[PDB]
Amino acid sequence: NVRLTFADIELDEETHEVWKAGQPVSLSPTEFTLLRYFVINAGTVLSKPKILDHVWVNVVESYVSYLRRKIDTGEKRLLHTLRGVGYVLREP
Amino acid sequence: KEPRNVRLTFADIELDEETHEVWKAGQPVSLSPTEFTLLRYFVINAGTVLSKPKILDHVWRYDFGGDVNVVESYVSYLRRKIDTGEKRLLHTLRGVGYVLREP
Amino acid sequence: VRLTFADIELDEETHEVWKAGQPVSLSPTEFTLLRYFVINAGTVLSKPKILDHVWRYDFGGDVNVVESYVSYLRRKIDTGEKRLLHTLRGVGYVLREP
Amino acid sequence: VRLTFADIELDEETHEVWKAGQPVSLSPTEFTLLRYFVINAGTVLSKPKILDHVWRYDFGVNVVESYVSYLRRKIDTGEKRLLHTLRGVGYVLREP
Amino acid sequence: NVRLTFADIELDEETHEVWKAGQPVSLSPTEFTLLRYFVINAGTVLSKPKILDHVWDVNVVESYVSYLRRKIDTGEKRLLHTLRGVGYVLREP
């Protein structure tokens, strides 16, 4: 998917460029892989071991946190936690 | 191999389809791919009033998130970047849609 | 590849531009307009002539694109104590030294 | 091309480095030293070993101590430190 | 002379890079050509018509000598000098 998108998040797999609300965002390779995994699986609740398996437990929490800081600090939050099940990318 | 023109223009907006560079009134504007696609769609269709349904259909793949609320958001982002000056080019036709035209 | 008039410098290859020794960023249309003035330095160029050269004769609308782009270009490039880009009312514009 | 340990990421092709998702600029020697640690994560590496790996045995191990310091100041800035000194033994890259 | 120098002025004819006292200096193509002309002719007094001939209005020479001075010659020891009625010269005090 040349351009890949969900809501107002945009990724370019060839350049590894990312935008949120039209503004560029600099991600490390792991952060990009992680965001891509959420976006391709938008709306699906993803456990930590599942994320760990596909992107590579505490490292998952760390990188979800890093990613949230770069891409999810606006009024409407797209990356959500639901305890004991995992994380989900979805509109409120 | 390079005898080429890949620029589009409307009024004082200039776009390069290859680089996705954009200029407004001679000044560079940084657009995301979605903002670029949206601007291109307005430019190619300048003077036409475009409902939120058509834009959605054209600016993203059908398999995207199909909500006229995303369109509204992106039109907002685009306007902030490209349509800041005294004469606005990007107008809202309440209950009908948006149009790129001279006022 | 080097085109100059007074202290305006254009690189015809890279489309780099300098004024008074300092780099100036121009859009593609601004560069084309400036080049047209420079290769015609001292020659008066009417608005219809510039319009049909840089754009085309039917590139119409409400406000005139030639006037607009001359303004933009002057704000970028014609900042010296001595102006080089002059308006000749009813006739056009000319690039020349005062 | 991609080498990672915890939240340190190296691109073996471009020599780009990230820590906690943020780019970090390293000198060629700092990059070699960091790569050596990452490919040997969890393995204790003595100063003479690092010296002869990154430089050579007859450099003449203060340079190892210096470059570990430089690298820690660039890369080992998280709340949890990853680059650990083992007195009389060497250094190890590991999660606390 | 891929690398060209006088005193603490340095020019790189391939990259058109310039340094003064070890610090980079950005010059336009005309400024570079003009500085190069002074450097190759270090110590020689150069009239305005001579400079005009080789680098390209008499006022354009004055203008560019001024621009060049501002970028490369504002330290304690000045290297680019005016000899009124004769021209300009690159030399140490």
Add this chain to the structure above:
Amino acid sequence: KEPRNVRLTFADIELDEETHEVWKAGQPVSLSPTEFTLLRYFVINAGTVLSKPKILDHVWRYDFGGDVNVVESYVSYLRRKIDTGEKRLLHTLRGVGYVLREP
């Protein structure tokens, strides 16, 4: 095409002969070509005391400006950029010259 090492090292100074990049204690340093040539000359000759005459002869072409005062200037410019740490590597031997060495 690129099985290559073009780097020189002394202590915590690193130079790349191709790109003319330099690092001191891991941090980049920008040198002019003359400063680079001078550093290279000290590095290749580390521990040797070098008079102003030798440096002049080696760091510029003979057909340059042959003044030991230029050497002094450039050694000053180089020290300011590469040798500002607590532990100085570039030393002056009054009446004899300069040397790159640990103190």
